Design a protein around this ligand. Structure first.
Ligand SMILES: [Cl-]
Ligand SMILES: [Cl-]
Ligand code: NA
Ligand code: NA
Length: 129
């Protein structure tokens, strides 16, 4: 599923991400835009052999099991394919674990490089929330 901007903001809000660990909703929407272009089915392979999955591009070296990343942890205890569902629940629950691990949203390279320090509230402007 490819979400609309306000549709995803609403779904993320209902799943408890607004101000989760101090990150306002616009941060999460901005990160999803530049990680996946709002497409739950997005995958990208990394140089080290791991793969990134879903709307928030969660990596198989640490967070999910895809059966082909040797020596990986499955810290969210989920198959990586579950992160590609039109239902974002599994991506949201795993992202909450990631953002709590010490580095905040800096774990998402596109957030650091394209969202951090910008007017992220613009990503939810106009939405009925
Ligand atoms: Cl915001
Ligand atoms: Cl980047
Ligand atoms: Na929308
Ligand atoms: Na893994």
């Amino acid at each position: 599923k490819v979400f609309g901007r306000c549709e995803l903001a609403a779904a993320m809000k209902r799943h408890g991400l607004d101000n989760y660990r101090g990150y306002s909703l616009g941060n999460w929407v901005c990160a999803a835009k530049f990680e996946s272009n709002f497409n739950t089915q997005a995958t990208n392979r990394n140089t080290d052999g791991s793969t990134d999955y879903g709307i928030l591009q969660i990596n198989s070296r640490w967070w999910c099991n895809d059966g082909r990343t040797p020596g990986s942890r499955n810290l969210c205890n989920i198959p990586c394919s579950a992160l590609l569902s039109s239902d974002i629940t599994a991506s949201v629950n795993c992202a909450k674990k990631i953002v709590s691990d010490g580095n905040g949203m800096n774990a998402w390279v596109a957030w650091r490089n394209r969202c951090k320090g910008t007017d992220v509230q613009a990503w939810i402007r106009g939405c009925r929330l």
